[PDB]
Write a protein that binds this ligand. Structure first.
Ligand code: ADP
Ligand code: ADP
Ligand code: ADP
Lengths: 449, 441, 362, 38, 459
């Protein structure tokens, strides 16, 4: 609903033959790059390949990120699209290669069938039974609970393990409550009071809920979407048991941990069981590393091994930089800011500047996307920028010009409202002239160097 | 107290035409910049467009912060306005990227509405039953209006509140049934005399009228950051306030973004996007700029406003200079506002407002001399001399600040340029950049 | 229009128009989801994916009316260790045959040559000796010894028993005549004897009392304790376990992972202990003596990630039902009881559930 | 209905307040405060 | 128990003990020497206006710079400002070096000290009953509840103080507190009227002889009235409100109690908390139940701050609740700690310097140094011949003020060791030979460390 830099992008706008329509799905031009991005979408949808690298190469403002977000829409919601900047990699909690691995496994999805095996009923009896321990000093301990559950199809009496009674107790269950018990986890939920004895005069603000219809014991099945990283985090910070470690692990502050290769390898074995059991579909996705020049030579040297993994997502890099110094490696310059070792691994999709008529087309697509009804002379004015100034400066003027026009009572933006927008809101280059002319000498009114 | 910007009470523009008045709402001059900030201010209020970065640029002083403070006053309390100094981002508890993510998400409000239900009545009786050696408690509250009596059962949480509030018969109380909070409004009976230590007798009140229960629609605004913190945790929601929150995982934010959209479609919530003002933005690193530039591109990005004093200046964390000290591919995404140094009549009008805000009665010649000082020493220094001259005038019991007091203040307190000469005139006795010094006479 | 729940499922199933033909079968389920999505898939109480093993019930008919619910939950990640490592002395701290070091080392490093043992402390209790201060810290040699050997959890349980008597002294020994009296064996607990926190709780104008509770009050006043959860973990698992083919491992698993003293401390006194303590002839101090498990910060979600579907969610999950809700309230104020006709018979059941929620009448 | 063996009951109204003690707690330590210990 | 020492309460002397104030007329003009100062008449008069700026509650977020060479009395002036304000106004001194915590970001460390320099004065009434329990006695109710057999309408307690005793009629609900707290006759308790509960201090030491052994310490009978109703005035800083909200102290759960058993690590207190604290504070100020008392954050060696600290201070000083900041610096024109390309005067960024009222401190004349030697000698308790005074003052001209003040104590030792109750030239001429200045030692270095060598200094 809110309008942002890419709201006009809907897809790659390809034909069924995989040729790009010169203006489609919000794009103008980049056709060869949109066609290359189509073949990458085909590489992703065909699950067979792991750890292929793509680099979107091209100057700033050439639509590299629009291409990546268009890929994210051609893949649709089912496939994991995992966007990060290279500046997100420097965590204070864990080594930066941990964050890369977390993002690699976040980009691999799993859809898995799960059977939840549960008891539901109104608690009609609850009777604890206990033992006098030998002198351990903590005193007597509850040995078991007997609990009666009533549903619509009769009732059942449960002799609970005291580990499950601790779930019942920390859930503050009472006689006459309706509860859900999940035998998968031993976990408990108090659903409410019964709608029986649902008198109004409680300060407790109870939710009275109807007696569970059906059998008191149920075995529902549901389909869960999870990533491999979701499993890593679940097994590294255990929280689903009723044991003391799981219990205290919900009271401690959450913190990221450098999950070992040993854990990740053994979760591959677990997930492959789900595949062989036929309860899971593996759905590998894509990791978009934007601003990949902000990675460093340790990140890039780790990515070598990470991409060689027998399962890894597709990685799409984007970079906007020429021959530049590699970060963390001030001795080494290379094109794109990517090490010459790593660049050999990628397929480079070069991305090119727009022509003036393409800028005019983009300005009109962008204007109507924002709902800026804009006259043709006003379109031509805005498209003189983008040629003489960055393309982004065109698109950013459309909103001020709309405000100024409507403040002038106009229904639509004239050349006048842009010419005022051009004056209130400078480009970087005109501001850079103001600096060099005003800061031409120091003083009270000078700019600070 | 009176602070550096306490006189700024708005942007000073005609709400219809966005024409800046030459002086109103405490702002003076900067008309081109104030109109530009008024167009930004309107596209903030409209909410429609996300992720606009506007840089306010100018030499030191010339009101760039004052303009940003005028915008904040004109939005009022409801729209979020997250002030951030760029030096806050260099946390030891979280990365710069996470610190920026939190600062963005602090700037988007979720405005959530609920129907509470409340009670208003005289307590006729209280019964509480307590298990010896603790554990369970039970009780009944008998509560009254002119028109109803009813007996409500009480749980332990309510009995704790009742006893903490020391509720007694003849109290008038209200209970928010949804939150469970209690407040004593007063008493309808006298305070008794049979017991000691009953404490303060609260306000006399007539008994409440009407029904005991009343529904009450209430609205609460919470940030996306506050939703993040409590949904990344089971326990420890004080991290909203103590700042103990770590680097929150992106799975939690992706879920929250999806749910807040759903809450908007459900009509449960209104999203109210506000402003992140990054002052001193030149203090960020290249790594921070290469995060903001793509953080802006999201549908939930706030409007970002920045201020820089810097010329063509070195970017932090790299080897090279750029305008404003900001990377060019960052400035590509920015529309820039330029503020201009004030004229003497603008200086005079500002100093008159500062004098009026501090409640200082300048003589006309003192205002003239402060204006002359303002031209040569600066607006901040000439402002500092106003309060200083008021104090000096009070020493001599003067009813107004005379020229003698401004001259006395000018004598006692050096301006920056005069202090720089004083340093240059004492290079032997101050510690040099070589660390050498001479202590002798 | 369609609610987002309807819109998502409808779009996924109408996408099959591109795949197949079956058109009648598809357009039938168009009409289904466009009436209410709970006709197509009922919203029901749900929880994260469980990445763990559990024992399935194989039959309901054979189960009977009395059944024992064991805690079956185990990790699928499963660390096989030989008993030579896990039981027969590959754990350096576990004494036995083979591990001949551990028994000596435990006695000498924790007791004989341990500086906190009372006999060692007592030799160091004067002048410039390293325990000189222990006269003025309120601990005894026994409490110091305990606090140096018990872990932070056990020490925190011991704190639960104690009275903040130095804070009460701040209320009583006020005056110049009281000389701000302090027991000389507590002389060094300066910050306990002088602390505004105690005074702010006794003054009747609660001004500084409220100024110290600002954060907890506004957190609660914002409703963050009651607002629905916007996220939860997508997967959940129990702890990874050692698997060892020995009985000692099974005992030691129960001793650690289901630690009785920690659990008893968290969950408080057992009901017979409460009975014995309340009916006794003389008072007795229970253990611990209370439940030391904190109150959950989320007053409704508590300690589990299980969600229950709201009726307000059910109402808004159908665009027709959401639109009809306004029309039915208008029709109620127009004097009409509910009277409606449906092409799908199961929709009548959902409307009966809707009306029994709303308590409007047919 | 005969009262609970261990819930001591406080009630307050216009007449002031009272505490009532179960017959089962008289002769326990909890009775000592009420003049009805062992 | 403790064996009290009867000896005289003298005091240690430090480098600033002679300073007692700014030494100003009621017209604010500096007296040429007064309150321990000699000279600096301009800087003392300027600090006197700063003192009146602080005592007038109009000030928020003003900045001061004390600028001048080492030895020029800038720290003396800051301490004199603090003494002119006295104890009722916070003075919070730090160096710039103290901001480089390992445990939170340095902008948090600075904002803590910034809020430490802001005080709050809260007035409330304490209202309690206190004493040794003389009695406990139930009053049987007129109308007992059916089925209970016992029903008490009042519990009566006798409380004795040193100053009297009272028969106290209490609501029977206090049974809950007494039974939990295990109050007994002869225990010392108080009753607080805002709850009606009671707390036990201990057993009265009148009963310390009841047994040969009992496992509690006894406490004295309360020496006040049996009933206290007092106004109480609480010194609070806003930083105290930060910490008290951000880490609650009294929590009775395992995680709270484990928390209080582990080091109380600082945390990056949110601006949301601080801004709500301010709003509730301003509410209570408008109720008139509290005074705000903003004080002084003094940062010495402020040239040790870096440009990140200074840019945050811009935002901080703009806060509507803020102390005054007084900076001191001696760094000439010098490189900014965090901006190695930028040099500026005082080592303060030109952006920030424009905010400060600069106060220059100048060197001392030979006759002022001599007067300082006189003031210092009588403060250390040393007494000098005039020729010893003149010899010390001559080193003050040729070497440094600080060095000469540091010669006084060594020469006093040598004088009394030689049997002389006053120091003379023969002792000064000996103190100056045992204890070199930096220059004479630097000459020894310059001669001896001309090269590597077996007896060389290490360069
Ligand atoms: N071919 C195109 N068609 C339509 N819009 C485009 C095209 N290329 C770029 N844009 C738009 O121009 C703006 C800048 O493009 P962007 O992807 O940010 O460039 P880069 O990421 O390389 O800096 C965005 O609003 C983007 O949606
Ligand atoms: N146009 C103006 N009207 C009123 N006060 C102003 C104006 N410009 C600056 N000031 C005041 O002068 C001081 C310096 O301005 P400020 O906004 O701090 O400049 P900077 O851009 O350096 O932040 C502040 O106290 C500010 O309130
Ligand atoms: N005007 C003065 N009158 C009296 N004593 C002074 C004066 N100025 C400095 N001193 C003393 O001489 C020493 C040097 O002053 P100090 O404030 O330490 O210098 P700086 O400000 O360079 O650190 C201190 O012991 C100080 O007490």
């Amino acid at each position: 609903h809110r309008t942002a830099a890419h709201t006009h992008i809907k897809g790659l706008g390809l034909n069924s033959s995989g040729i790009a329509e010169k203006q489609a799905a919000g794009f103008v031009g980049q056709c060869a790059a949109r066609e290359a991005c189509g073949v990458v979408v085909d590489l992703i949808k065909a699950h067979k390949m792991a750890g292929r690298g793509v680099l979107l190469a091209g100057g700033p403002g050439t639509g590299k990120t629009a291409l990546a977000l268009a890929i994210s829409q051609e893949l649709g919601t089912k496939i994991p699209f995992c966007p990060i900047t290279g500046s997100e990699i420097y965590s204070t909690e864990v080594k930066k290669t941990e964050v890369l691995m977390e993002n690699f496994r976040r980009a691999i999805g799993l859809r898995v069938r799960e059977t939840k095996d549960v008891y539901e009923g109104e608690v009609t009896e609850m009777t604890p039974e206990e033992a006098e321990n030998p002198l351990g000093g903590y005193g007597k301990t509850i040995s078991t609970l007997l609990i009666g559950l009533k549903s619509a199809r009769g009732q059942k009496k449960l002799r609970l393990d005291p580990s499950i009674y601790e779930a019942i107790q920390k859930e503050r269950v009472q006689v006459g409550d309706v509860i859900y018990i999940e035998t998968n986890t031993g976990a408990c939920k108090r659903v409410g009071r019964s709608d029986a004895y649902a008198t109004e005069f409680d300060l407790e603000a109870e939710e009275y809920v109807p007696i569970p219809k059906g059998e008191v014991h149920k075995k529902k099945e549901i389909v869960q979407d999870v990533t491999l990283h979701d499993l890593d985090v679940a097994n590294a910070r255990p929280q689903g048991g009723q044991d003391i470690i799981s219990m205290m692990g919900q009271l401690m502050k959450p913190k990221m941990t450098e999950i070992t290769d040993k854990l990740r390898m053994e979760i591959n074995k677990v997930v492959q069981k789900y595949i062989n059991q036929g309860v899971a579909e593996l759905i590998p996705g894509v990791l978009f590393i934007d601003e990949a020049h902000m990675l460093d030579i340790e990140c890039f040297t780790y990515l070598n091994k990470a991409l060689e993994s027998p399962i890894a997502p597709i990685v799409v890099l984007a970079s906007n930089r020429g021959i530049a110094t590699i970060r963390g490696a001030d001795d080494l310059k290379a094109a794109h800011g990517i090490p010459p070792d790593f660049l050999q691994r990628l397929l480079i999709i070069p991305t090119h500047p727009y022509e003036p008529d393409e800028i005019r087309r983009i300005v009109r697509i962008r204007a109507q996307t924002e709902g800026v009804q804009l006259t043709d002379a006003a379109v031509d004015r805005v498209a003189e920028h983008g040629v003489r100034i960055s393309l982004r400066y065109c698109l950013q003027l459309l909103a001020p010009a709309s405000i100024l026009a409507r403040v002038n009572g106009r229904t639509q933006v004239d050349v006048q409202d842009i010419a005022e927008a051009e004056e209130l809101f400078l480009d970087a280059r005109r501001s850079a002239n103001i600096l060099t002319s005003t800061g031409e000498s120091g003083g009270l009114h000078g700019f600070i160097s | 107290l009176i602070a550096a910007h306490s006189h700024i009470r708005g942007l000073g523009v005609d709400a219809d035409t966005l024409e800046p008045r030459p002086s109103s709402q405490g702002l003076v001059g900067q008309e081109k910049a104030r109109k530009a900030a008024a167009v930004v201010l309107e596209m903030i209020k409209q909410g429609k467009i996300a992720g606009r970065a506007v840089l306010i640029a100018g030499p030191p002083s010339t009101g760039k912060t004052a303009i940003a403070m005028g915008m904040a006053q004109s939005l009022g309390q409801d729209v979020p306005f997250t002030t951030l100094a760029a030096s806050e981002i260099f946390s030891l508890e979280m990365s710069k990227t996470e610190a920026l993510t939190q600062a963005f998400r602090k700037s988007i409000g979720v405005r959530i509405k609920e129907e509470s239900e409340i009670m208003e009545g005289e307590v006729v009786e209280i019964q509480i039953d307590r298990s010896v050696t603790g554990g369970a408690k039970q009780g009944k509250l008998t509560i009254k209006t002119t028109d109803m009596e009813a007996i409500y059962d009480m749980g332990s949480k309510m009995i704790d509140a009742m006893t903490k509030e020391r509720v007694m018969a003849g109290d008038i109380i209200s209970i928010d049934k949804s939150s469970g909070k209690i407040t004593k409004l007063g008493r309808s009976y006298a305070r008794s005399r049979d017991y000691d230590a009953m404490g303060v007798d609260t306000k006399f009140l007539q008994c409440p009228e009407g029904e005991l229960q009343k529904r009450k629609e209430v609205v609460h605004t919470v940030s996306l950051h506050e939703i993040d913190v409590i949904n990344s945790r089971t326990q420890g929601f004080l991290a909203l306030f103590s700042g103990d929150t770590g680097e929150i995982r992106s799975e939690i934010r992706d879920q929250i973004n999806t749910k807040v959209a759903e809450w908007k479609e459900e009509g449960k919530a209104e999203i109210v996007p506000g402003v992140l003002f990054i002052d001193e933005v030149h203090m960020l690193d290249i790594e921070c700029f290469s995060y903001i530039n793509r953080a802006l591109e999201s549908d939930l990005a706030p409007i970002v406003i920045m201020a820089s004093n810097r010329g063509v200046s070195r970017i932090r964390g790299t080897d090279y200079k750029s305008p404003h000290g900001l990377p060019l591919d960052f400035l590509d995404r920015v529309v820039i506002i330029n503020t201009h140094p004030y004229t003497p009549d603008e200086l005079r009008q500002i100093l008159s407002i500062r004098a009026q805000e501090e409640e200082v009665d300048l003589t006309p010649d003192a205002l003239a001399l402060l204006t002359k000082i303002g031209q040569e020493a600066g607006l901040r220094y000439a402002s500092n001399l106003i309060t200083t001259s008021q104090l000096i005038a009070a020493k001599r019991r003067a009813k107004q600040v005379g020229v003698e007091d401004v001259q006395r203040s000018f004598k006692l307190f050096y301006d920056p340029a005069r202090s720089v000469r004083f340093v240059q005139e004492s290079e032997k006795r101050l510690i040099g950049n070589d660390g050498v010094v001479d202590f002798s006479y | 229009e369609l609610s987002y729940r309807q819109r998502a499922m409808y779009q996924s199933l109408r996408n099959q128009i591109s795949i197949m033909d079956t058109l009648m079968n598809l357009v039938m389920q168009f009409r289904k989801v466009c009436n209410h999505p709970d006709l197509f898939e009922r919203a029901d109480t749900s929880s994260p994916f469980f990445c763990g093993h559990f024992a399935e019930t194989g039959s309901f008919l054979r189960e009977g009316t009395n059944v024992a619910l064991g805690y079956s939950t185990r990790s699928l990640v499963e660390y096989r260790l030989p008993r030579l490592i896990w039981c027969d002395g590959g754990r350096l701290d576990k004494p036995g045959p083979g591990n001949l070091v551990a028994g000596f080392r435990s006695k000498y490093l924790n007791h004989m040559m341990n500086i906190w043992t009372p006999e060692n402390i007592r030799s160091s209790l004067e002048g410039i000796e390293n325990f000189t201060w222990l006269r003025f810290v309120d601990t005894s040699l026994q409490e110091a010894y305990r606090a140096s050997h018990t872990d932070v959890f056990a020490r925190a349980v011991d704190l639960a028993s104690k009275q903040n008597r130095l804070g009460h002294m701040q209320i009583v020994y006020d005056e110049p005549e009281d000389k701000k009296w302090t027991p000389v064996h507590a002389l060094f607990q300066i910050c306990e004897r002088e602390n505004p926190k105690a005074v702010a709780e006794i003054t009747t104008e609660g001004v500084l009392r409220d100024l110290m509770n600002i954060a907890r009050v506004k957190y609660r006043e914002l409703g963050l304790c009651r607002l629905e959860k916007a996220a939860r973990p997508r997967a959940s698992a129990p702890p990874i376990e050692v698997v060892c083919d020995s009985r000692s491992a099974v005992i030691e698993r129960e001793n650690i992972m289901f630690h009785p003293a920690m659990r008893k401390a968290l969950f408080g006194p057992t009901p017979s202990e409460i009975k014995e303590a309340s009916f006794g002839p003389r008072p007795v101090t229970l253990y611990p003596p209370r439940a030391l498990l904190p109150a959950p910060d989320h007053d409704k979600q508590r300690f589990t990630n299980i969600t229950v579907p709201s009726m307000a969610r059910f109402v808004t999950d159908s665009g027709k039902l959401a639109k009809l809700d306004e029309l039915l309230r208008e029709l109620k104020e127009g004097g009409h009881r509910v009277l409606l006709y449906f092409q799908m018979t199961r929709m009548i059941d959902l409307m009966e559930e809707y009306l029994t929620y709303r308590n409007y009448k047919y | 209905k005969r009262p609970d063996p261990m819930m001591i009951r406080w009630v307050n109204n216009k007449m002031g307040s009272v505490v009532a003690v179960p017959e089962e707690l008289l002769g326990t330590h909890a009775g000592v405060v009420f003049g009805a210990g062992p």
